[PDB]
Amino acid sequence: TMNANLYKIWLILDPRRVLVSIVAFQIVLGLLIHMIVLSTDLNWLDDNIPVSYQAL
Amino acid sequence: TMNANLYKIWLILDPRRVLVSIVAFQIVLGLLIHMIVLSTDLNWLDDNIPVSYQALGK
Amino acid sequence: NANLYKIWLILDPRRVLVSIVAFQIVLGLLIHMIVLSTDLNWLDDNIPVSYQALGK
Amino acid sequence: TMNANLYKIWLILDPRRVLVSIVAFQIVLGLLIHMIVLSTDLNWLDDNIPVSYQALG
Amino acid sequence: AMLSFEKKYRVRGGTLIGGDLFDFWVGPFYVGFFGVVGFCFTLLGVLLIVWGATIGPTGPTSDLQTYNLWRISIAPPDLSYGLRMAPLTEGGLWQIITICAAGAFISWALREVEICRKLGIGFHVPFAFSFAIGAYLVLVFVRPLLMGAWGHGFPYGILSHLDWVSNVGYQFLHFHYNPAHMLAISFFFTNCLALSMHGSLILSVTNPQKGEPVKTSEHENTFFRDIVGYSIGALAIHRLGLFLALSAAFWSAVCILISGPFWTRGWPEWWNWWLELPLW
Amino acid sequence: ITHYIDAAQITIWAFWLFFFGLIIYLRREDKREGYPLDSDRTERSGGRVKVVGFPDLPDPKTFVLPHNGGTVVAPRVEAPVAVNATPFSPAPGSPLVPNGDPMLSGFGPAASPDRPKHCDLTFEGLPKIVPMRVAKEFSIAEGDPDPRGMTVVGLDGEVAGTVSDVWVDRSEPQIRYLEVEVAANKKKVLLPIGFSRFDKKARKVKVDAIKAAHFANVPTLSNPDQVTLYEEDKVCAYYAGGKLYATAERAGPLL
Amino acid sequence: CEGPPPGTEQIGYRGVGMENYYNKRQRALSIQANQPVESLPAADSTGPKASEVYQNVQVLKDLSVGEFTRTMVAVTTWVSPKEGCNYCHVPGNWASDDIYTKVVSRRMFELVRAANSDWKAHVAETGVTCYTCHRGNPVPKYAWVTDPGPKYPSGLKPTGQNYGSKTVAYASLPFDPLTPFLDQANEIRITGNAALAGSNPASLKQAEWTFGLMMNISDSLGVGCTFCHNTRAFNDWTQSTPKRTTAWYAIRHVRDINQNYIWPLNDVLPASRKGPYGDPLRVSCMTCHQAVNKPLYGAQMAKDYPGLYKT
Amino acid sequence: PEYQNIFTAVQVRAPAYPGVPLPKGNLPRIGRPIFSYWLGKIGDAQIGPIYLGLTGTLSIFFGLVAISIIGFNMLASVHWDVFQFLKHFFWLGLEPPPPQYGLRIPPLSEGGWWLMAGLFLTLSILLWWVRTYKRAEALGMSQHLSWAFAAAIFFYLVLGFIRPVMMGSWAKAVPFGIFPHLDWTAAFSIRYGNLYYNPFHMLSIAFLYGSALLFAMHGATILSVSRFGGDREIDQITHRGTAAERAALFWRWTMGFNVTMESIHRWAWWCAVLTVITAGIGILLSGTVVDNWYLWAVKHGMAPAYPEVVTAVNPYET
Ligand SMILES: CCCCCCCCCCCCCCCCCC(=O)OC[C@H](COP(=O)([O-])OCC(O)COP(=O)([O-])OC[C@@H](COC(=O)CCCCCCCCCCCCCCCCC)OC(=O)CCCCCCCCCCCCCCCCC)OC(=O)CCCCCCCCCCCCCCCCC
Ligand code: BCL
Ligand code: BCL
Ligand SMILES: CC[C@H]1c2cc3[nH]c4c(c3C)C(=O)[C@H](C(=O)OC)c4c3nc(cc4[nH]c(cc(n2)[C@@H]1C)c(C(C)=O)c4C)[C@@H](C)[C@@H]3CCC(=O)OC/C=C(/C)CCC[C@H](C)CCC[C@H](C)CCCC(C)C
Ligand SMILES: CC[C@H]1c2cc3[nH]c4c(c3C)C(=O)[C@H](C(=O)OC)c4c3nc(cc4[nH]c(cc(n2)[C@@H]1C)c(C(C)=O)c4C)[C@@H](C)[C@@H]3CCC(=O)OC/C=C(\C)CCC[C@H](C)CCC[C@H](C)CCCC(C)C
Ligand SMILES: COC(C)(C)C/C=C/C(C)=C/C=C/C(C)=C/C=C/C(C)=C/C=C\C=C(C)\C=C\C=C(C)\C=C\C=C(C)\C=C\CC(C)(C)OC
Ligand SMILES: [Ca+2]
Ligand SMILES: [Ca+2]
Ligand SMILES: [Ca+2]
Ligand SMILES: [Ca+2]
Ligand SMILES: [Ca+2]
Ligand SMILES: [Fe+3]
């Protein structure tokens, strides 16, 4: 349920500073999540799938 | 049971300074709570459910 | 006391609210962290079941 | 669906600073991604493919 | 000899002790009462150091006596002498030289006070020098006293006193974890950064690029605001540098004062109060 | 094989060579003010002998002042300036004694060089140090008392006057002088912040340097709305003379 | 925080700074906590040897029956005083070895006898009893197992360090030096014997493992490094104290105890006596010394029990 | 009593200074300056604005990546447990790769994160060096700061990069962590036979002590003549005042010689810079040239000798 006057938020919070912060937060959050997953069983880089590429 | 004049809280506290603080706190609390849960038996990433994906390659 | 309301003639209502809000959040975090450090820990107690065991 | 008035974003964010920050971000990302992959099974420098050159000596 | 602007400052008076008796210069040096007293302590101490080098630890005929500059060492007495005076050849020489040094150091600072009085300047320099004296006195007086023997002092030898530091440090297994020591080092390091920052900025605005005029206070503030978003100010940088240097000396004295008198175990184990807090 | 010479020993010796060269460099830079020295050897040699020590003086450098302020050279030949004092003893190394009333002698801690008769300038070229009456964009920081209207007391607690204005640094905002309207003669004189302690609750400025009656002789400004370097030093030196001269006990000694 | 004055002892030559400091009040309470249990009255040393009276005596053969019984009473107080004789014995059958505690105890007798007779370079004439380790507890309070450290996610290999661990006296040094040095026998020396580079392949990381072991050794004996070293030259035996020579043999002694006495008992010890890696609780410097430079402050207990010596 | 000029008793305010205008090609500064009353008690109350072009933006990005890689691994080493991360923070670290990998890029699971943190902090610092150079260029100032910064970068580079490469192994570099990097410091001295006997260690100490000596002297000297405007060193240098005259005479009368208002900052500059120059050389020579500094000091006749009051039989001989 959203309000019909929700657009008035841009009379309160600076659009410029909000946009910059969002892309900064999302970029940092995305780096963090990729980091967490690599450090777990879900790692898709060192899983040797489809094959191991390190030949003897 | 809230007070009818509770809206008057925005006559005392700046709505703008309040909104930024809630967003920052909620982001950090969210990050904090996720990490605490990952540190326990509740971990949903290293639990090998549904399967262990590293076994598939070793 | 009947004249307790005059406390707001002495102490700034705006900083007291902020101090109460700030103090309560830290205290809440502190108390959770204390309880989670003891036998009362409800997250790593394998209750209702151990989910790491479920994956072995 | 792209918006027809999206161009007005350059009325909000400074075009020069945006350009500078993208270049900076991408140089970092490029080095970071190359290094992560070099620390994994996908490494293409020490994989002895097509041969190991330290063994010819 | 005098600086070409110096003669108009060579005023009579402002002594703490001595008055007209010793109120004179010897070349550049001001003497005064504490100049005379300090000179005697100093020449004696230096000559007794050289005499200790002449006879060595076990007499001038032994193979341990040496004038090698790194190897000369005058050592404090055995701990068994406690707070008593040892024989001159068994550490008492060290004990007399220590008193000369303290007297030499304290006389130097009081002479500085008389010079400040002549020049009508603040007393910051002798006040700051007192922190160095205090640290020396913590090392040779307060800390030995609290532990009960002058022999806890360090020896007077260019390399031999590093052996003292080494073995005292490792009595606590891993002396790096001393909290006052960490704090003091932070001050020593921060002081060095701040000093290079200050020296660089003054030389760079008074010696600008060729063809440029001397730069301004506005340049100085702008320059560090441009780099770190803050400028402390040309007065405050001198406030900061004094605070950092004195803090480094103070926490030095604290960090050795607590090592023995107020703590006897390894220094890492001190941090177990943190680890054992009921939060984790 | 074995060799006595090794790279650590070679390098440490190389450092000493660098370091002693550096020390001589630094000692040369140190002689760009105050040299050659005033000695009695230069007097008796009829000026043939200049006392400079070792190393000798560097070749002169030039400082280019902004806003067409001219050129400063260092080292420089400075004209001897008379010393308003007579020797306590004729023997070398003896102090001197100020002529007349010491406060007014310009000697000892009352002394100062003759700085330039112009005003230090902002980057934009305005007089840097000015009263708040002129720099109307300045204000007192909220939380601190306004010194204007505070009472100025001398070392003996007597009322010297009232703070009539505050002189600020326009380049790096701070109070540099208080302006004191002296009760005795109604003249307006500068008071350096370095000589001022605020007693905020009393709204009093305490000046330990001089007595209330000494405020009558603070050097005066040629122009009431700016201050020259020359006047800055004359003002500060007059207060500083009080540290040694303002009372008898201040001559010393303690014992 | 502690209060002055500390107790002090000079170790080296004056001014070298080899000095020990300790807290007088903690020493007094430690001395109270390291009291030796008074020895039993002497028994008649005559009559038949235990080898010919009892049915399954494999170690204490030459003791008289009196000296043998006296020994059984003593070990009960030292090891299992709450449980009594039947901690190690099948009720109604003293000869039976059909309980794991008796099999372990038999080897413990050989452990102690080997210590008292063959390791005097370490334990001198003081020696050890069961009490030295057990202190009236069946399971020694200060036994150890290989420490796995904190949990990591599956994609990160544990470092074995950078963690607040009591084992290295609360440094962040490698926190399990016991397994590589007091169980296995990894080389502890890293200092070179030549001024110039060219012949010392030891590494900085080996230095950190060695440093971690020395914290543990020092912490186990309640001493600083200067108890055994002149720290201007850690490697130089000529500037070390005789305690360093003693410590050298003690390291080899500890290795012998774990490899040859404790480890072969692993299969017969219950799972409760084993660490997460399946290894048995075993012996370090702390197990006997318990933060004292000599166990029990050098109390001579073994000398009153002839059965605690070989042949 | 007197005013010591330690705290500003009465602060004044004026609209924030936006900074000296920079030549075309420099980006506009960013930030709306604020005033801190409490910063204004000890120094300048203005915070901001700041310059941030491509160099500093690239620098900060590299630096945030580096710092986060470190922190992530610290948190991972207590299994994401934030409370244990706070408990153990001073002990946690990001560890260099094992020696078995030499100078090759090691696996993500065992040292790859250290090498990435080291690479990106190093690039972050190098870009910060360029920033210090550019900010002086845009103001028309000489490059003394960037020269001194280069000396610090030299030492930093020797510790973590130059020496490990010379020694053929990242395992010989420094771990990222509070107490872990203290372990490294002590272990380094142990391994190389007591760093006290390294002569460049001795020199580096002389210059580190000298920096505190010189700033105590200079810091205290200037405050004592600040009553004469001595803190305004630009105009005291171009137009010697009684501040600069009284300062020199205090020291001339104390110890027989003195410097100038300009040249003390040269003494200060060189003392601070030589601290890290000699430190780099000392570390650069350890392991590469000298393996045991004590035995090197013995060899050149420097090590003190003492009467023998303790001694130990070497069980390896017996
Ligand atoms: C692996 C390395 C990794 C490093 C990573 C770094 C990352 C950054 C990379 C990029 C680096 C870029 C470098 C700068 C680029 C260009 C900058 C520029 O604008 O140039 C124009 C620049 C400006 O021109 P200018 O007209 O002079 O303008 C000056 C201004 O007007 C105002 O000038 P001023 O009036 O203030 O005067 C300037 C100042 C000049 O000072 C400096 O600017 C440089 C300061 C030195 C920095 C480096 C430290 C040196 C360490 C030496 C000790 C090593 C131990 C071994 C000893 C070996 C030597 C023998 O004057 C002095 O201080 C005189 C110094 C005299 C030297 C010592 C005196 C004795 C010498 C020997 C005496 C004889 C021996 C026997 C004697 C016998 C009797 C006893 O040209 C210069 O003249 C200045 C040169 C300085 C720039 C280069 C050097 C510093 C920068 C690199 C430092 C690196 C440190 C690493 C050391 C490693 C260990 C050895
Ligand atoms: C075993 C534990 C569960 C789990 C349990 C929970 C629970 C329980 C909750 C979350 C919630 C969240 N989880 Mg989780 N979470 C899991 C796994 C993940 C993983 C992952 C890689 O595995 C990720 C990236 C996330 C991410 C997130 C966020 C989307 C969200 C908290 C945002 C916040 O703090 O906003 C703070 C920012 C603000 C308040 C500013 C205002 C909000 C703005 C306007 C909206 C932003 C988008 C919004 C969060 C969308 C939520 C949509 C869906 C309900 C997810 N979860 C696992 C499987 N997660 C929370 C949630 O849904 O919140 C609604 C929540 O309560
Ligand atoms: C026995 C162990 C129990 C438990 C016992 C308790 C107890 C007991 C209490 C909490 C309280 C809290 N617990 Mg807990 N808690 C458990 C598990 C959790 C977990 C988890 C991951 O497992 C989380 C994230 C939380 C989170 C929280 C918060 C909802 C709350 C603290 C708010 C605060 O500090 O306000 C401080 C900030 C302010 C006062 C600011 C002013 C008002 C603000 C702006 C509005 C806040 C809305 C408020 C949170 C609404 C929620 C009330 C519901 C009844 C929960 N609990 C387990 C199951 N928890 C407290 C609580 O319920 O408070 C009412 C409390 O006393
Ligand atoms: C003379 C030798 C000494 C010395 C000199 C020296 N150091 C120097 C310099 C010099 C001359 C500089 O010019 C340079 C400097 O700029 O100082 C002001 C520097 C410096 N010395 C530094 C530190 C330093 N120096 C040290 C030592 C020393 N420096 C010496 C003893 C040490 C010690 C003792 O170990 C340290 C820790 C830095 C303060 C600075 C170099 C800074 C740098 O390289 O920065 C880039 C690196 C980063 C990691 C950037 C990270 C970004 C931050 C995390 C900020 C995040 C911002 C973000 C936008 C926030 C957004 C959040 C939103 C929610 C708002
Ligand atoms: C408190 C911050 C720092 C500091 C500040 C400080 N030091 C100061 C001052 C100040 C403000 C001065 O005004 C004063 C000065 O005049 O400097 C030029 C001084 C000074 N600080 C000095 C030294 C110095 N300060 C040091 C440290 C520090 N000083 C701090 C870290 C150290 C260190 C770290 O070791 C030393 C080497 C002198 C240059 C000078 C004081 C000169 C003086 O007092 O002269 C009279 C004494 C002699 C000429 C020699 C006396 C000889 C003795 C009688 C016999 C020797 C006994 C001695 C104990 C033997 C030591 C042997 C071995 C250790 C090698
Ligand atoms: C979860 O955490 C978040 C994300 C929230 C953020 C928190 C971060 C935190 C808390 C970080 C804490 C960091 C701390 C405490 C760090 C302490 C660091 C210390 C004390 C470091 C001290 C010294 C380190 C040194 C000297 C390292 C030097 C390393 C160098 C010079 C390495 C260089 C490596 C290079 C150049 C590699 C090149 C790679 C090549 C090119 C060779 O590839 C083949
Ligand atoms: Ca894959
Ligand atoms: Ca899962
Ligand atoms: Ca549960
Ligand atoms: Ca390939
Ligand atoms: Ca480590
Ligand atoms: Fe300065």
Numbering used by the authors:
A (entry chain S): 3 to 58
B (entry chain U): 3 to 60
C (entry chain W): 5 to 60
D (entry chain Q): 3 to 59
E (entry chain L): 2 to 281
F (entry chain H): 5 to 259
G (entry chain C): 23 to 333
H (entry chain M): 2 to 319
Paper text:
In purple phototrophic bacteria, the cyclic electron transport chain is composed of three major components, two membrane-embedded protein complexes—reaction center (RC) and cytochrome (Cyt) bc1—and a group of soluble proteins that shuttle electrons between the RC and Cyt bc1 complexes. In most purple bacteria, the RC contains a tightly bound multi-heme Cyt subunit that functions as the immediate electron donor to the special pair bacteriochlorophylls (BChl) and as an acceptor from the soluble carriers. We present here the crystallographic structure of an HiPIP-bound RC in which the RC contains the tetraheme Cyt subunit and is associated with its core light-harvesting complex (LH1-RC, ~390 kDa). Both the HiPIP and LH1-RC were isolated from the thermophilic purple sulfur bacterium Thermochromatium (Tch.) tepidum (γ-Proteobacteria)11 and their individual structures have been determined to high resolutions.
The crystal structure of the HiPIP:LH1-RC co-complex was determined at 2.9 Å resolution. Each LH1-RC bound one HiPIP at the surface of the Cyt subunit, covering a range from Glu60 to Asp120 and in close proximity to the low-potential heme-1. Most sidechains of HiPIP residues could be modeled based on the electron density map with higher accuracies for the interface residues because of their lower B-factors. The interface between the two proteins displayed a zigzag shape in which the large sidechains of Tyr76 and Trp116 of the Cyt subunit and Phe48 of HiPIP likely function as shape-recognition residues. The nearest distance between the two prosthetic groups was 6.5 Å as measured from the sulfur S1 in HiPIP to the 21-methyl carbon of heme-1, and the distance between S1 and Fe (heme-1) was 12.2 Å. The path between the two prosthetic groups is mainly composed of uncharged residues: Thr13, Leu17, Phe48, Leu63, and Ser77 in the HiPIP and Tyr76, Thr91, Val95, Thr98, and Trp116 in the Cyt subunit. The closest distance between the two proteins was 2.3 Å as measured for the hydroxyl oxygen of Thr79 (HiPIP) and the aromatic nitrogen of Trp116 (Cyt subunit) which form a strong hydrogen bond. Superposition of the Cα carbons of the membrane-embedded RC L-subunit in the co-complex with those in free LH1-RC revealed that conformational changes mainly occurred on the binding surface of the Cyt subunit, with a maximum deviation of 1.2 Å. The heme-1 macrocycle displayed a significantly bent conformation along the diagonal of pyrrole rings I and III compared to that of heme-1 in the free LH1-RC. By contrast, essentially no change was found for the conformation of HiPIP.
